[PDB]
From Swiss-Prot, chains A, B:
Forms a beta-barrel structure that accommodates the hydrophobic ligand in its interior. PANTHER family: FATTY ACID BINDING PROTEIN. Its main location: cytoplasm. This is Fatty acid-binding protein, adipocyte. The gene is Fabp4. It comes from Mus musculus (Mouse). Monomer. Homodimer. Interacts with PPARG. GO terms for biological process: brown fat cell differentiation; cellular response to lithium ion; cellular response to tumor necrosis factor; cholesterol homeostasis; long-chain fatty acid transport; negative regulation of DNA-templated transcription; positive regulation of cold-induced thermogenesis; positive regulation of inflammatory response. The modification Phosphoserine is found at S12.
């Protein structure tokens, strides 16, 4: 869980627009959201993990305990129920809302942090490099 | 509870340095936080209340349900236990950490939003205004 700690900055994005479309994000919002190069800031305090995301589009921050369900207001304004687990050495986040569900996998690969967001077969890959 | 929704700009601050000195904030970071003019954005989505404070010092965000205890990592990086209730029409917040406790009271006084931070005697008062 300590391998993800640090300040990462986006360097690559693929299929992010197809992914946002599937989750239901609006046309104009997908536009400005895709133009953003957010910075992910991960921190830990005891058994509490913090994932802060900062960008021009919107700033978000979720604090959680591994394996314990929590309420989350996503950047695109969805009120979802989240659950984050340390699965296969990767932080795997599942978001459930309105009968639908999406998985956000954050894994380490060498000097980078790969973020795979999936929704009904559509997959978006965003690569982060430590700032 | 609906009387708090909206973006709020800080227009006044009194005895904030004294309050931070009491909560244990360091001299250096205490002068950096004293120069910031935060933008408190309150929003609601069902039974979830979100309070997002944006500034140059640090961007924080807390989502919570009234009367239900939750874990919080403050702007000055304190790992506290918070409980926010609607007491006397005001949004009263009590943070507890290491046997210590401080109350932050958010109330509406006309066209403005007043915030009273108290920590063993000393009281800070920061007044906001719709942005
Ligand atoms: O905050 S943004 O990226 O703008 C964002 C914008 C719009 C919709 C989003 C939906 C899910 C996750 C995001 N965050 C995210 C962040 C990094 C990697 C993968 C997903 C969303
Ligand atoms: O985020 S800051 O103000 O920088 C902040 C900085 C340093 C220490 C703080 C302690 C308690 C509450 C804050 N927030 C707060 C914000 C607005 C009104 C009342 C309290 C603190
Ligand atoms: Cl590394």
């Amino acid at each position: 869980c300590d391998a993800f700690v640090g300040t990462w900055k986006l360097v690559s994005s693929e299929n992010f627009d197809d992914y946002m479309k599937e989750v239901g994000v609006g046309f104009a919002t997908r536009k400005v959201a895709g133009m953003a190069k957010p910075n992910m800031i991960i921190s830990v305090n005891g058994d509490l993990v913090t994932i802060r995301s900062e960008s021009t589009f919107k700033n978000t921050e979720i604090s959680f305990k591994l394996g314990v369900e929590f309420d989350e207001i996503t950047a695109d304004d969805r009120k979802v129920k989240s659950i984050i687990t340390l699965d296969g050495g990767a932080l795997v986040q599942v978001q459930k809302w309105d009968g639908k569900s999406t998985t956000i996998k954050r894994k380490r690969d060498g000097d980078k942090l790969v973020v795979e967001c999936v929704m009904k077969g559509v997959t978006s890959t965003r690569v982060y490099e430590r700032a």
